[PDB]
Design a protein around this motif. Structure first.
Motif, PDB file in Angstrom:
ATOM      1  N   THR A 155       0.830  -1.190   0.000  1.00  0.00           N
ATOM      2  CA  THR A 155       0.000   0.000   0.000  1.00  0.00           C
ATOM      3  C   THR A 155       0.875   1.254   0.000  1.00  0.00           C
ATOM      4  O   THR A 155       1.994   1.242   0.527  1.00  0.00           O
ATOM      5  CB  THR A 155      -0.932   0.006   1.211  1.00  0.00           C
ATOM      6  OG1 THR A 155      -0.161  -0.039   2.419  1.00  0.00           O
ATOM      7  CG2 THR A 155      -1.868  -1.180   1.171  1.00  0.00           C
ATOM      8  N   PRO A 156       0.398   2.342  -0.612  1.00  0.00           N
ATOM      9  CA  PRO A 156       1.181   3.587  -0.592  1.00  0.00           C
ATOM     10  C   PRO A 156       1.491   4.075   0.809  1.00  0.00           C
ATOM     11  O   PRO A 156       2.564   4.652   1.034  1.00  0.00           O
ATOM     12  CB  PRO A 156       0.282   4.576  -1.352  1.00  0.00           C
ATOM     13  CG  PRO A 156      -1.087   3.962  -1.324  1.00  0.00           C
ATOM     14  CD  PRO A 156      -0.849   2.491  -1.376  1.00  0.00           C
ATOM     15  N   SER A 157       0.586   3.854   1.763  1.00  0.00           N
ATOM     16  CA  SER A 157       0.880   4.208   3.146  1.00  0.00           C
ATOM     17  C   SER A 157       2.096   3.445   3.654  1.00  0.00           C
ATOM     18  O   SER A 157       2.979   4.028   4.295  1.00  0.00           O
ATOM     19  CB  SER A 157      -0.339   3.930   4.023  1.00  0.00           C
ATOM     20  OG  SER A 157      -0.847   2.628   3.784  1.00  0.00           O
ATOM     21  N   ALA A 158       2.168   2.144   3.359  1.00  0.00           N
ATOM     22  CA  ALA A 158       3.324   1.351   3.766  1.00  0.00           C
ATOM     23  C   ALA A 158       4.590   1.807   3.057  1.00  0.00           C
ATOM     24  O   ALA A 158       5.668   1.833   3.659  1.00  0.00           O
ATOM     25  CB  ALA A 158       3.069  -0.132   3.502  1.00  0.00           C
ATOM     26  N   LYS A 159       4.487   2.164   1.774  1.00  0.00           N
ATOM     27  CA  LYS A 159       5.670   2.633   1.056  1.00  0.00           C
ATOM     28  C   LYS A 159       6.200   3.932   1.653  1.00  0.00           C
ATOM     29  O   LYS A 159       7.417   4.109   1.799  1.00  0.00           O
ATOM     30  CB  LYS A 159       5.350   2.813  -0.426  1.00  0.00           C
ATOM     31  CG  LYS A 159       6.570   3.117  -1.279  1.00  0.00           C
ATOM     32  CD  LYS A 159       6.532   4.527  -1.844  1.00  0.00           C
ATOM     33  CE  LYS A 159       5.419   4.679  -2.867  1.00  0.00           C
ATOM     34  NZ  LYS A 159       5.480   5.990  -3.564  1.00  0.00           N
ATOM     35  N   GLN A 160       5.302   4.851   2.011  1.00  0.00           N
ATOM     36  CA  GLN A 160       5.735   6.102   2.629  1.00  0.00           C
ATOM     37  C   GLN A 160       6.289   5.864   4.030  1.00  0.00           C
ATOM     38  O   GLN A 160       7.258   6.517   4.440  1.00  0.00           O
ATOM     39  CB  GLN A 160       4.579   7.096   2.652  1.00  0.00           C
ATOM     40  CG  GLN A 160       4.081   7.460   1.264  1.00  0.00           C
ATOM     41  CD  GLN A 160       2.675   8.025   1.265  1.00  0.00           C
ATOM     42  OE1 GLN A 160       2.208   8.566   2.270  1.00  0.00           O
ATOM     43  NE2 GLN A 160       1.986   7.898   0.135  1.00  0.00           N
ATOM     44  N   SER A 161       5.693   4.933   4.780  1.00  0.00           N
ATOM     45  CA  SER A 161       6.239   4.547   6.074  1.00  0.00           C
ATOM     46  C   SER A 161       7.556   3.798   5.950  1.00  0.00           C
ATOM     47  O   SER A 161       8.253   3.631   6.954  1.00  0.00           O
ATOM     48  CB  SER A 161       5.235   3.686   6.835  1.00  0.00           C
ATOM     49  OG  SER A 161       5.099   2.415   6.225  1.00  0.00           O
ATOM     50  N   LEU A 162       7.879   3.293   4.761  1.00  0.00           N
ATOM     51  CA  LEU A 162       9.213   2.764   4.514  1.00  0.00           C
ATOM     52  C   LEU A 162      10.195   3.880   4.198  1.00  0.00           C
ATOM     53  O   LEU A 162      11.338   3.862   4.664  1.00  0.00           O
ATOM     54  CB  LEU A 162       9.181   1.760   3.364  1.00  0.00           C
ATOM     55  CG  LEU A 162       8.898   0.314   3.746  1.00  0.00           C
ATOM     56  CD1 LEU A 162       9.051  -0.576   2.532  1.00  0.00           C
ATOM     57  CD2 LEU A 162       9.838  -0.114   4.852  1.00  0.00           C
ATOM     58  N   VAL A 163       9.758   4.855   3.403  1.00  0.00           N
ATOM     59  CA  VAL A 163      10.636   5.959   3.037  1.00  0.00           C
ATOM     60  C   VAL A 163      10.986   6.806   4.254  1.00  0.00           C
ATOM     61  O   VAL A 163      12.108   7.316   4.361  1.00  0.00           O
ATOM     62  CB  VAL A 163       9.990   6.803   1.921  1.00  0.00           C
ATOM     63  CG1 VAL A 163      10.824   8.041   1.631  1.00  0.00           C
ATOM     64  CG2 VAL A 163       9.824   5.970   0.660  1.00  0.00           C
ATOM     65  N   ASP A 164      10.051   6.956   5.198  1.00  0.00           N
ATOM     66  CA  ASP A 164      10.228   7.939   6.266  1.00  0.00           C
ATOM     67  C   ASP A 164      11.452   7.635   7.126  1.00  0.00           C
ATOM     68  O   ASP A 164      12.171   8.552   7.539  1.00  0.00           O
ATOM     69  CB  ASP A 164       8.965   8.015   7.128  1.00  0.00           C
ATOM     70  CG  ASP A 164       8.834   6.847   8.090  1.00  0.00           C
ATOM     71  OD1 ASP A 164       9.435   5.786   7.832  1.00  0.00           O
ATOM     72  OD2 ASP A 164       8.126   6.989   9.107  1.00  0.00           O
ATOM     73  N   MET A 165      11.705   6.357   7.411  1.00  0.00           N
ATOM     74  CA  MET A 165      12.772   5.961   8.319  1.00  0.00           C
ATOM     75  C   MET A 165      14.103   5.745   7.612  1.00  0.00           C
ATOM     76  O   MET A 165      14.951   5.005   8.126  1.00  0.00           O
ATOM     77  CB  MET A 165      12.376   4.696   9.081  1.00  0.00           C
ATOM     78  CG  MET A 165      12.146   3.481   8.199  1.00  0.00           C
ATOM     79  SD  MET A 165      11.979   1.957   9.147  1.00  0.00           S
ATOM     80  CE  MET A 165      10.509   2.305  10.107  1.00  0.00           C
ATOM     81  N   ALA A 166      14.312   6.385   6.462  1.00  0.00           N
ATOM     82  CA  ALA A 166      15.482   6.112   5.629  1.00  0.00           C
ATOM     83  C   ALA A 166      16.815   6.255   6.356  1.00  0.00           C
ATOM     84  O   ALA A 166      17.647   5.342   6.240  1.00  0.00           O
ATOM     85  CB  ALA A 166      15.435   7.011   4.384  1.00  0.00           C
ATOM     86  N   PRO A 167      17.100   7.335   7.094  1.00  0.00           N
ATOM     87  CA  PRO A 167      18.380   7.375   7.812  1.00  0.00           C
ATOM     88  C   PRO A 167      18.455   6.359   8.933  1.00  0.00           C
ATOM     89  O   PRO A 167      19.536   5.818   9.195  1.00  0.00           O
ATOM     90  CB  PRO A 167      18.443   8.813   8.341  1.00  0.00           C
ATOM     91  CG  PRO A 167      17.026   9.197   8.500  1.00  0.00           C
ATOM     92  CD  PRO A 167      16.294   8.541   7.366  1.00  0.00           C
TER      93      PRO A 167
END
Lengths: 48, 49, 209
Positions: free
Chosen positions: C110-122
């Motif tokens: 889901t796009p929500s999950a993809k954005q929650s993956l991007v958020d924690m990048a560092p």
RNA sequence: UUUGGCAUAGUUCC
DNA sequence: AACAGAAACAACGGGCGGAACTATGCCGGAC
DNA sequence: GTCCGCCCGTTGTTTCTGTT
């Protein structure tokens, strides 16, 4: 429009004149807008 | 004036509305040779662009 | 069918082994080269109501330059991975002290999950790979020339040698299939080695941006 | 030793 | 239940060869 | 001297799921 706004108008003559001046300036810039009066001068030839 | 203008210019219609008027009717007769004259007088046209 | 599901799981595992080997991680020859029957024997020839249940296939492997830097390869059992699944995986990574992880998805995220993956990048690095994208190795296709990831030292030396600013190199998108295969971030430079018809070899360079 | 323009039609050559 | 990210379909706008040579009609109307 | 024919890149509209 200057004369009308000096001598007082009927609250719609000013608006119609504003729209007419807007049309003239817009057609001076570009005379090919979709859905416009397509201003001409004589013999039916559109302007440039 | 209407008949004379439409025959003179070739724009088949009124002068005021020569925008959608179909141009190309009423050409000026070719007179270079007799064969040119005859083949001009017996000629067709498809209005396709 | 059970045979087809075993085949798909085996192919995905083999491609991920090749991916880890290319990324420099330490995968042995026997792990790289498993026959279908060997995989059937080791981890179940019956998927449906069987030992392989898209779990216990997760791979933990250590980079050849640092055993402390390790990567996970998780297999979600859900066709649509969700926020709570991503949180569970991040919790497991945090408890095992692991920075990077791969996630192979049944159908999509889901796009929500993809954005929650991007958020924690560092904090953490996680990548999504579809089930269809790993049945083949795109690197082995003959249309794809060899790619080499270049160190910052090699980049600096190259830039100094040609007197180039990084704006002046050819580019490659971070969403490129090969870029995702190698796990390359923006600002890294890849090197392309390919044979040529008029010279015999030609080395190009691409900037990930 | 001085300079019109717009449109339409036909024709030549690849 | 409210909000938000991503996508299917529909409407709109710009784009469409190169040169060259003749000819003909017309450039506002009433009072 | 006064008046009056086809293709395909953008943007909108609408819809359908995911999170909390």
């Amino acid at each position: 429009l200057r004369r009308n706004e000096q001598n007082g108008a009927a609250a719609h003559v000013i608006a119609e004149d504003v729209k007419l001046l807007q049309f003239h300036v817009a057609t001076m810039v570009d005379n090919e807008l979709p859905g416009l009066p397509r201003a001409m001068q004589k013999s039916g030839r559109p302007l440039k | 004036d209407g008949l004379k203008y439409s025959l003179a210019t070739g724009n088949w219609g009124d002068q005021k509305k020569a925008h959608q008027a179909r141009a190309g009717v009423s050409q000026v007769l070719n007179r270079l040779t007799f064969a040119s004259t005859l083949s001009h007088l017996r000629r067709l046209n498809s209005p396709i662009g | 069918d059970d045979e087809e599901e075993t085949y798909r799981l085996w192919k995905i595992r083999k491609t991920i082994m090749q991916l880890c080997h290319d990324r420099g991680y330490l995968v042995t020859q026997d792990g790289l080269d498993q026959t279908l029957e060997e995989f059937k024997a080791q981890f179940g020839g019956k998927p449906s109501e069987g030992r392989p249940r898209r779990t216990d296939l997760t791979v933990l492997v250590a980079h050849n330059d640092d055993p402390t830097d390790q990567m996970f390869v998780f297999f979600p059992e859900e066709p649509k991975v969700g926020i709570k699944t991503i949180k569970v995986y991040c919790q497991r990574m945090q408890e095992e002290n692991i920075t990077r992880a791969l996630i192979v998805v049944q159908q999509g995220m889901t796009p929500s999950a993809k954005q929650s993956l991007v958020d924690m990048a560092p904090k953490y690095i996680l990548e999504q790979f579809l089930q269809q994208e790993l049945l083949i190795n795109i690197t082995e296709h003959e249309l794809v020339p060899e790619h080499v990831v270049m160190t910052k030292e090699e980049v600096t030396e190259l830039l100094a040698r040609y007197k180039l600013r990084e704006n002046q190199l050819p580019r490659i998108q971070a969403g490129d299939p090969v870029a995702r295969y190698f796990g390359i971030k923006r600002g890294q430079v890849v090197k392309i080695i390919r044979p040529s018809e008029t010279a015999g070899r030609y080395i190009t360079y691409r900037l990930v941006q």
